[PDB]
Amino acid sequence: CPEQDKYRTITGMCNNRRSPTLGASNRAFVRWLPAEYEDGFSLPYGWTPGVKRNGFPVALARAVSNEIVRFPTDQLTPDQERSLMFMQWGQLLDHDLDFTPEPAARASFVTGVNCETSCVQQPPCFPLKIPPNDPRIKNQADCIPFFRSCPACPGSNITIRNQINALTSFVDASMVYGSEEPLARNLRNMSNQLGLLAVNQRFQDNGRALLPFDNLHDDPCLLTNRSARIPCFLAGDTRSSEMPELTSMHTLLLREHNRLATELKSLNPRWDGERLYQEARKIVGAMVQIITYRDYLPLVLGPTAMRKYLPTYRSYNDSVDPRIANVFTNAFRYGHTLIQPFMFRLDNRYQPMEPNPRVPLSRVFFASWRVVLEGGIDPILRGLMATPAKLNRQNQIAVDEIRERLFEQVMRIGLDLPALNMQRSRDHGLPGYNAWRRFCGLPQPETVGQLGTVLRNLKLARKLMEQYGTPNNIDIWMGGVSEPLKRKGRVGPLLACIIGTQFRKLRDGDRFWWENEGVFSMQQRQALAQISLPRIICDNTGITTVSKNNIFMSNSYPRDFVNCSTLPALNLASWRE
Amino acid sequence: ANFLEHELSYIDVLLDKNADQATKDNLRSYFADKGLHSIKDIINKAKQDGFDVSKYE
Ligand SMILES: [Ca+2]
């Protein structure tokens, strides 16, 4: 692996020359704190009945969800200063960074149970048990299905279990391009020398490209509309079909790639396919870094944490670990608090669009067919710009479309995503709330009253102590989102630390960071500074009026919108050699 | 593992008499790296993985 490369590898190998696997795909997560398992090696807390964590029973994740996360959904508080696009960018970004493989249901044959149908707790299943008097699951012998995330060293319980990141930790648009060489080439247009990505061959979106179809053996998308038979989409990341809002952002960048490669071919006609692809991929990668660090993250962290954890960039530092920490996989799920119970779709004029302008999310999961057959991505993208995000509040944590009805259409029961989050941090052996507080330099409350003070909400503190017994046992997602939001951000101090720490490392430890010397020329970097998400939307959709910067704050039409005319296009002249 | 629907267009290109032989050869190298060596290996995989291949002899 060389020492004068100019483009990233697909897998992330050789970003850190001294240690070329750092940040590469299909490796274990770095641990920022040692794992915490029931048996010190692999069993998740909750696994063995009557086995307490730090002197207290383990709370059923679903009970914690029921008593703490549940709220009347029609009482949801719109967020006056964020758009839904602020939620959707966090989901899409997270799919640049981390994906944790779990085993297939068909590995159940002969051996363990099908975790999808049985409630039997044996490997690889860790089903969520149902509390008494559950509002929805009235049979206590039922369960919410759960597959344990795959072990990173399969074997003999001598080493502490850890989990695998199937993606490049780098902010490199792997969601678009693949973190593996065969996928990455499957995503490519290999029938010519234009450097494009493959596109669908049976359908287009008002003359514009759609993602190609993937071929899965148990395709969930086909089940959301039996007659339409629209399968899931093929992308850099396996989840691009989970929500048409997410599909829409994947499709946006797919077109931006091909539009870029088209310009770059007009500019430099002698460049071959490989070179066109790599150069567009390079630009698309910096766009994701720029949107992420310039526009999105300041509005997650708020100014104070933005300055503490993400100071002004100096240059590349090959001594920082760019890997994704295990805890971040769970902490970056703060965004489930921003999620609205409906997919909103709007027309030409940002007015409700028929057929269905307000579709419950539980009829939208894996509904690939709504992109192809119900108007393409323009109405979805307008909805994301001109609808408020949900506001996280301490008694309106998450909506029931994801807490009672997750993937209802493609599973034997609706799942509970918050409960899944807490079961997943247990699966991953993550330490509790106070241990992450300590790691972050933050007071650790021990009493209900002291928890009261940290949360500035005695009533939430009592509910948390009722479920968990001690703040030490609070699951990281639950305690993280229970904290009051920092000023002009959407997380408390704990998650601000974890999240901001992770992204500093991803920037400072990325040899191909767009501002580092040598990656781009001085002129290319002054061109890239112009780019914005609204402009990307202008270049690749039928949408002529878009959100004004900052798109993640803008959220009311027509107040916060402008014509596309207003916006400088990206100037690729600096690429003309 | 599975054959992808958009790879069916690649088959149309291998079977296009007037298609640049340099282009057919890049497509054959792509399919070779996937374990599909003859035209019939390519078709048969496409078919095995759920696609209609009537139209190809
Ligand atoms: Ca990545």
Swiss-Prot record, chain A:
> Between which residues do disulfide bridges form?
1-14, 115-125, 119-143, 221-232, 440-497, 538-564
Q: Which residues bind Ca(2+)?
A: 96, 168, 170, 172, 174
What glycosylation sites does the entry record? 157, 189, 225, 317, 563
Residues at the active site: 95
Binding residues for heme b, per the UniProt record? Answer: 94, 242-243, 336
Post-translational modification Cysteine sulfenic acid (-SOH), affected residues:
150
Q: At which residues is there a site annotated Transition state stabilizer? A: 239
Report the protein name in the record.
Answer: Myeloperoxidase
Organism, as annotated: Homo sapiens (Human)
Q: Which residues of the full protein are shown?
A: 167 to 743 of 745
